[PDB]
């Protein structure tokens, strides 16, 4: 509040940014990650356009915005825009200076080494940050319950991560990185809607798909039995009068797209359903480690709020796997902020000093200081 530097809490993704004040429990400001141009010519004088529009400002008025996506899994097409995206967060809402308080960020597993240094360069050189750190998504969602033995699966808009982090981290391969989350779901629906004629073309209405999705759409329990149910017009035909003015009866369209999750064959890949990858992370570890893993499976990420996402797991996991222990998956109810809950902790830890980076530490060991010492 006043005494002691007091550090902030943040969690940037490739779709939605989570950031609030300091010493909080949950994000206070969650603005969308969008920045486009006025392909059109702004009125050009009815402001020197520039500002691609962002925050609640851009999301409020997409219409005349060519939403340009800067961060696509790993590669950032342009860093120049990111500079003015962070110049809005700490000031326009939080009304606090980073040249005063530390900073905490999230680490996207297996991200180019050059990126973690490019970011830090923006802080240390310009925003003068004597103290900060970048922790690993999943591991944060962990330290917030009451046990030191659980497997975590954290994901949202970036990429899927099957991290069996319970007793320790990193041994053979176990962990997995799969580019198939959030943004991928928003991109797949528009393609499949073309079969019925509906074709949300431009990237502006592309977002409307995501907005509509998180209100009615659900996951197919069993596509076979649900297909025969199509004969009826009660559980299928769903009402959603476009705020514009044209109803879209999303009946067989709701539980069609999610099927891709279990069937990556529909997106040109050999990756199997998420219940096979589960085995892929269990078969690698020791033999006397499984019985307790099934007894605890952490499922974090707001993506896992789709009706029919948890009940399916018990059907496929119990099939081709040992079946004499307690099969149990911990899917936190509000599992989207599970990372934010753990974030507020690291920022307050004192042992954190053993891990974080100090101003001088960045110059002594060079830019690689971060991931050259830690993991």
């Amino acid at each position: 509040d006043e005494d002691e530097t007091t550090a902030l809490v943040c969690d940037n993704g490739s779709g939605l940014v989570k950031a609030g004040f300091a010493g909080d429990d949950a994000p206070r400001a969650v603005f969308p990650s969008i920045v486009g141009r006025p392909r059109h010519q702004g009125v050009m004088v009815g402001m020197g356009q520039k500002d691609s529009y962002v925050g609640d400002e851009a999301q409020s008025k997409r219409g005349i915005l060519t939403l340009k996506y800067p961060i696509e899994h790993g590669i950032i097409t342009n860093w120049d825009d990111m500079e003015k995206i962070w110049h809005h967060t700490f000031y326009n809402e939080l009304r606090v200076a980073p040249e005063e308080h530390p900073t905490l960020l999230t680490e996207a597993p297996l991200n180019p080494k050059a990126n973690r240094e490019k970011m830090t360069q923006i802080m240390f050189e310009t925003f003068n940050v004597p103290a900060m750190y970048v922790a690993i998504q999943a591991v944060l969602s962990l330290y917030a319950s009451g046990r030191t033995t659980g497997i975590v699966l954290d994901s949202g808009d970036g990429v899927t991560h099957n991290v069996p982090i319970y007793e320790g981290y990193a041994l053979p391969h176990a962990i997995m990185r799969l580019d198939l989350a959030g943004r991928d779901l928003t991109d797949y629906l528009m393609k499949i809607l073309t079969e019925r004629g509906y074709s949300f073309v431009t990237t502006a209405e592309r977002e409307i798909v995501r907005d509509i999705k998180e209100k009615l759409c659900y996951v197919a329990l069993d596509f076979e039995n649900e297909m025969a149910t199509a004969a009826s017009s009660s559980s299928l035909e769903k009402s959603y009068e476009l705020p514009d003015g044209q109803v879209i009866t999303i009946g067989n369209e709701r539980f069609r797209c999610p099927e891709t999750l279990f069937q990556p064959s529909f997106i040109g890949m050999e990756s199997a359903g998420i219940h096979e990858t589960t085995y892929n992370s269990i078969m690698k570890c020791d033999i006397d480690i499984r019985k307790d893993l099934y007894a605890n499976n952490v499922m974090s990420g707001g993506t896992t709020m789709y009706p029919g996402i948890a009940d399916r797991m018990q059907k496929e996991i119990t099939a081709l796997a040992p079946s004499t222990m307690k099969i149990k998956i911990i899917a936190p109810p509000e599992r989207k902020y599970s990372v934010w809950i753990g974030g507020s902790i690291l920022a307050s830890l004192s042992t954190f000093q053993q891990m974080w980076i100090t101003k001088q530490e960045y110059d002594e060991a060079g830019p690689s200081i971060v991931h050259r010492k830690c993991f």
């Binding site: 009815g46 402001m47 020197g48 110049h87 009304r95």
Partner: protein, 232 residues
């Protein structure tokens, strides 16, 4: 009118914040300045402004629709408030007041340039109207933001121990030669006559219009001695 306050703000930061003597939050990374506000540097200190009501309060535009009404009324005062047309301000009537006020300030400057003004500046003792109490901070601030002590180093010239010409005159009259009522009248030639007859280099001293300037105290001894070893 379609450029409210937020859009108007952007027409300032871009136009300026590059021209010298004007800051804000963006360029000058200071949290004290809001994202909607800016930092305007005067010849004194720093001031930040809000935006509430900027337009309607500033526009001032007064067309000939609200004015003409009262003029066509029937009352010895209503039309009387609008006195004999054109009092020291005529030219042409129909035009936004935005330019009318601009002429008001221009009528203040132009008439002050070509003349012989006289300067009077006052300072307030205290905010409690007390006769004896001096507020150090407040008074010191007034002497600061007005830039008066700077003139003491500029209007004068700037250094350590300072003395006048007029007041220095009626004090060391009987110590110099040819500086008596028989003076020619020319100061520049008078001052030179004061030093040249005692053999002193030109650059050693500095002479403006008023106030004599000798750097460092020790030089005063140099003068006192120079007069001692020329005539016992």
């Amino acid at each position: 009118a379609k450029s409210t306050d937020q859009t108007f703000l952007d027409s300032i930061c871009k136009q300026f914040e590059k021209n010298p003597h004007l800051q804000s939050y963006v360029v000058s990374k200071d949290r004290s300045i809001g994202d909607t506000c800016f930092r305007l540097k005067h010849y004194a200190g720093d001031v930040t402004y809000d935006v509430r009501g900027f337009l309607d309060k500033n526009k001032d535009t007064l067309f000939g629709d609200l004015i003409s009404s009262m003029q066509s009324s029937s009352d010895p005062l209503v039309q009387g408030l609008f006195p004999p047309t054109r009092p020291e301000d005529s030219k042409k009537r129909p035009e936004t007041a935005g330019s009318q006020f601009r002429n008001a300030m221009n009528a203040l400057i132009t008439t002050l340039l070509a003349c012989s003004p006289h300067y009077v500046r006052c300072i307030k003792s205290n905010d409690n109207k007390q006769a004896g109490v001096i507020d150090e901070d407040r008074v010191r601030h007034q002497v600061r933001y007005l830039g008066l002590l700077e003139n003491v180093r500029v209007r004068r010239a700037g250094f350590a121990g300072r003395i006048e010409y007029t007041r220095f005159y009626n004090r060391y009259k009987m110590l110099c030669k040819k500086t008596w009522p028989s003076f020619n009248g020319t100061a520049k030639q008078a001052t030179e006559l004061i030093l040249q007859q005692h053999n002193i280099d030109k650059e050693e001293i500095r002479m403006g219009k008023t106030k004599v300037f000798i750097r460092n105290p020790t030089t005063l001894f140099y003068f006192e001695e120079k007069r001692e070893l020329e005539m016992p």
